[PDB]
């Protein structure tokens, strides 16, 4: 006993508590990071739409103005 049992118990309890904290941290990490991922996926489609639209608009308007 003496330092033996007290060290065993105290270190085990503290390690368990810390590990539970890490588990919760990782869960929250995963949730928020998934939200960020879907947010970027949302960005992508509108980026593509904008580039296609601007390219077509500039080409068509330049041709139309030059021909006139």
């Amino acid at each position: 006993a003496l330092s033996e049992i007290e060290t065993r118990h105290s270190e085990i309890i503290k390690l368990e508590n810390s590990i539970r904290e890490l588990h919760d941290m990782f869960m929250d990490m995963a949730m928020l990071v998934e939200s960020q991922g879907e947010m970027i996926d949302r960005i992508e489609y509108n980026v593509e739409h904008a580039v296609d639209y601007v390219e077509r608009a500039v080409s068509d308007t330049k041709k139309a103005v030059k021909y006139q």
Partner: protein
Amino acid sequence: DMRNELEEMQRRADQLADESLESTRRMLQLVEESKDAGIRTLVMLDEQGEQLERIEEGMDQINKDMKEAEKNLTDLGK
């Protein structure tokens, strides 16, 4: 009458430890460092999410502006 009898004494084997104080301390230190790293990652991830949310509005505004300008120019052209 050489009939003898005895009594017994007991000893306790050492409790389970004396290997839980060298790897243990290193384990605790590593756990603390991992906790600090996780906190820092939390903060950085929240900041990145805020920045992405900020970007979204400008993205939508530019899309709307370009679409409206193109439609107006087409309408005036014809």
